[PDB]
Amino acid sequence: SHMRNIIVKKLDVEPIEERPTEIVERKGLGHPDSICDGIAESVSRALCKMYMEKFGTILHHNTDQVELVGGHAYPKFGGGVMVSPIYILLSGRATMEILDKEKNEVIKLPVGTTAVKAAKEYLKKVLRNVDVDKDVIIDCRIGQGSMDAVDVFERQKNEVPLANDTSFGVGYAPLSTTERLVLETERFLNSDELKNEIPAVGEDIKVMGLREGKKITLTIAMAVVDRYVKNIEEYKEVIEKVRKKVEDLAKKIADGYEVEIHINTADDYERESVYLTVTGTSAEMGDDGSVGRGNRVNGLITPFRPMSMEAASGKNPVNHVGKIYNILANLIANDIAKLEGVKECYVRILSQAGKPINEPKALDIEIITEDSYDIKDIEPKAKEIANKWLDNIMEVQKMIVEGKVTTF
Amino acid sequence: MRNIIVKKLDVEPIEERPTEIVERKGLGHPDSICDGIAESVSRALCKMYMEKFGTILHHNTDQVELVGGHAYPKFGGGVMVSPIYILLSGRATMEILDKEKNEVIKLPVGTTAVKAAKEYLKKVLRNVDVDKDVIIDCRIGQGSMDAVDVFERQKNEVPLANDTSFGVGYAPLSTTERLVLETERFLNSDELKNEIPAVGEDIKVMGLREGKKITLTIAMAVVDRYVKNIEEYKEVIEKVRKKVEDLAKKIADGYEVEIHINTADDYERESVYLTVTGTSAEMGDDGSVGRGNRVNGLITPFRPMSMEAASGKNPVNHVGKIYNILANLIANDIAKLEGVKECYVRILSQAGKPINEPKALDIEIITEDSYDIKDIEPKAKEIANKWLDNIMEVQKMIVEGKVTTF
Numbered sequence A: 001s002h003m004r005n006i007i008v009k010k011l012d013v014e015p016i017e018e019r020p021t022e023i024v025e026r027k028g029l030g031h032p033d034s035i036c037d038g039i040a041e042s043v044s045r046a047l048c049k050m051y052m053e054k055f056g057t058i059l060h061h062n063t064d065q066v067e068l069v070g071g072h073a074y075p076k077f078g079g080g081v082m083v084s085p086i087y088i089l090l091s092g093r094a095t096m097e098i099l100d101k102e103k104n105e106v107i108k109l110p111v112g113t114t115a116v117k118a119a120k121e122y123l124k125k126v127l128r129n130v131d132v133d134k135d136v137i138i139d140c141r142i143g144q145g146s147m148d149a150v151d152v153f154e155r156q157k158n159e160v161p162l163a164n165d166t167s168f169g170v171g172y173a174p175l176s177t178t179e180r181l182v183l184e185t186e187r188f189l190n191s192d193e194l195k196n197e198i199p200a201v202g203e204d205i206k207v208m209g210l211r212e213g214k215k216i217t218l219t220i221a222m223a224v225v226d227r228y229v230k231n232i233e234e235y236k237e238v239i240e241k242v243r244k245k246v247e248d249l250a251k252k253i254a255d256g257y258e259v260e261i262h263i264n265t266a267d268d269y270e271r272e273s274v275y276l277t278v279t280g281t282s283a284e285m286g287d288d289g290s291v292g293r294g295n296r297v298n299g300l301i302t303p304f305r306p307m308s309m310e311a312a313s314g315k316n317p318v319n320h321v322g323k324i325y326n327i328l329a330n331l332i333a334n335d336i337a338k339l340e341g342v343k344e345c346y347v348r349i350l351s352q353a354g355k356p357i358n359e360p361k362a363l364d365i366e367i368i369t370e371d372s373y374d375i376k377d378i379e380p381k382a383k384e385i386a387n388k389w390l391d392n393i394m395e396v397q398k399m400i401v402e403g404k405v406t407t408f
Numbered sequence B: 001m002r003n004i005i006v007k008k009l010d011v012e013p014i015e016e017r018p019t020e021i022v023e024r025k026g027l028g029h030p031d032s033i034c035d036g037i038a039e040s041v042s043r044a045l046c047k048m049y050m051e052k053f054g055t056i057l058h059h060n061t062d063q064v065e066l067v068g069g070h071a072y073p074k075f076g077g078g079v080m081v082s083p084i085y086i087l088l089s090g091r092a093t094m095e096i097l098d099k100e101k102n103e104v105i106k107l108p109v110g111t112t113a114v115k116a117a118k119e120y121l122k123k124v125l126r127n128v129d130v131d132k133d134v135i136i137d138c139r140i141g142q143g144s145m146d147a148v149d150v151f152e153r154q155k156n157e158v159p160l161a162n163d164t165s166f167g168v169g170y171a172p173l174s175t176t177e178r179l180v181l182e183t184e185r186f187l188n189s190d191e192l193k194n195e196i197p198a199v200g201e202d203i204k205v206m207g208l209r210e211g212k213k214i215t216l217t218i219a220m221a222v223v224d225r226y227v228k229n230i231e232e233y234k235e236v237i238e239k240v241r242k243k244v245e246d247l248a249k250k251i252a253d254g255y256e257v258e259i260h261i262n263t264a265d266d267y268e269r270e271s272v273y274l275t276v277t278g279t280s281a282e283m284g285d286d287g288s289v290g291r292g293n294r295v296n297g298l299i300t301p302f303r304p305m306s307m308e309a310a311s312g313k314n315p316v317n318h319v320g321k322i323y324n325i326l327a328n329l330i331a332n333d334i335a336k337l338e339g340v341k342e343c344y345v346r347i348l349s350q351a352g353k354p355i356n357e358p359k360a361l362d363i364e365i366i367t368e369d370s371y372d373i374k375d376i377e378p379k380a381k382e383i384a385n386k387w388l389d390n391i392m393e394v395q396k397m398i399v400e401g402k403v404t405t406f
């Protein structure tokens, strides 16, 4: 019998697929910006587990600040040279020392060492051809703050946090054909299965999707690992092999559309200027990266959908409402899109300062209905879903800490 | 035959929608400091390359990390405790090979970059001591050969796109958008700060519209050397509040405008938004590039946005910058057309293609009532073509500092 500020409105516009144009981009796992996002969030999760193990609660921190400076390299067919390591700077802030006045004690937490280790372990996980011992420098200037033990005691209650702000989050569902194709192309090209078959395929993968009516053009940037290509001929063969597999994929999930595929379009075979790398990422020299300049929490960049500019990765999963709302809005929209009669769904969430985060100032649900469905038949089910997720706001926090949801 | 596409868009105009959220991070905000420094470095390197070779060489310094410092604010004047650390980064042509001498010649990228960053900081932070309050480090590195090759391939003709990217633009600005934009610009204008030197440059403005009610929330750093006490601080807030009220009446006529300033203040305990330098960077707050305003100067989740960070990217062939400026220019001109209520422009590149040959130049138009898109389409198409014909004027506008990147 709990009452919230939930709004359901019928959205009387053309669905996304019926609109004539779509542009969708995804920065893959080995992309420098995605590397930074992933490190930012991995450090946060590591600190969360650090806090949980000591206190059984999560303390204030934000590590949504990571800078990747491109290294120096000399690619060469058969195996190139890494000259200067990739330099990564961890930044942000985290609670480090707890001042207890009652007890005459100070507890200090391994903030910096935890951070550096988390970053290193994430890099080891995603970058097959980077030797993290020699190819990377992980520096750390994360601020180390203090906190009164009494405030720790309060946090240990693990009550729903209050919104300390008027913040916004937006999400939508379902993914369009173009969105789905862009997303799964990158996922496939960075899957273990493909790597094993075509080890020359690096992790620095970018996928741009343009839809014109019922024609989808995929433009793929793909770093080739030079130890696996003996010459320009073998380089070409890798491109064609990848093209074939992407064609097959397009048939599987974009059947009915005309699909056109372009790979490494900056290449000039004549001048022998191609996307050749030593490590499989342009972070080795070609490009730099930092946090919040890539994918939204749904894993896409979508100028035909509403987007939040806030950088989710690295933000406090406890009390940063913007991060929580953008993830929550996505989770809610996804379930509402599963409902019978829902063609398209947009969810916007706005916080009420001074109020619990799961008691928003407004939660707006916009639904494009399928033909012959009444929005008023759907609305009850929709509000129930939204209220269910809001009741379980603390479960959303857990999902983030356990990495069961994406932040990029 | 350019790939220009024009569509009628049948949705509710933004002004008529019930809710609107708009944000602007002012010049002194840590993220905007980074954007500003990034662009200053690029402009400086452009000038240096031009002086030495009569041409611009490959670079992209769209990477600046600001690690917050620490300070001790105090009425009448406080002091810095730990310097703000800023890391200049990105790609740049660091050296050239003298093929005849068979020797490497180093270019002054590092010195040019560090000087440019310091000069910019001096400009936007009146009360910062760059010798004591800030550390500017530099790790800009050589770009890859493939990057340089694409840059040089047709630099003398029509440059080839540095990347596969899209830019976005739209027009006109809504009442809320213009209010947020002009509030910050006004409060960070030299004329106002000369009148009220207590006003720091770190000004964050957020506009929330609900119907015809606009709530303006302002977070404004106050410079503690210009406020003797909590009372003088209070007088600053109310002076600024009066100014913004007057401004709102001029450009938001017919709307109910609420103005909330530094809402986290606690006068009872004298815990207020006091700073030594006029920026929250001194408070341990961090910044980086492309975390804030788009090229139109706003953050707009109810408008289409590009995630590209224009600041610091080279103005020759990086479409991540050029197409975002170009899209804004085209949208503005189309918005001038009678029968056009709203216009959205999206411009997509393909890496290696001439920058005047976008893979798609996408135009959406909300028409005024009783106007035919068929009458508007040819005009919109001509504006787009006109601009692609003059695409080199974009570079020229950027280099001459005639447009903003944030």
Ligand SMILES: Nc1ncnc2c1ncn2[C@@H]1O[C@H](C[S@+](CC[C@@H](N)C(=O)O)Cc2ccccc2[N+](=O)[O-])[C@@H](O)[C@H]1O
Pocket: A031, A032, A204, A205, A206, A221, A222, A264, A265, A266, A267, A274, A275, A276, A282, A286, A287, A288, B059, B060, B091, B143, B144, B146, B147, B148, B150, B161, B162, B163, B164, B351, B352
């Ligand atoms: N040779 C390449 N061809 C295609 N894509 C690339 C190449 N190198 C890197 N990328 C991918 O593009 C991303 C941004 S890169 C950003 C450019 C900028 N950092 C620069 O300094 O040149 C693009 C790029 C870099 C070097 C050569 C060619 C390109 N390019 O035309 O695309 C980068 O993060 C990679 O994922």
Ligand SMILES: [Mg+2]
Pocket: A033, A288, A289, A290, A293
């Ligand atoms: Mg980038």
Ligand SMILES: [Mg+2]
Pocket: B031, B286, B287, B288, B291
């Ligand atoms: Mg920020």
Ligand SMILES: [Mg+2]
Pocket: B165, B307, B308, B309, B320
């Ligand atoms: Mg980009």
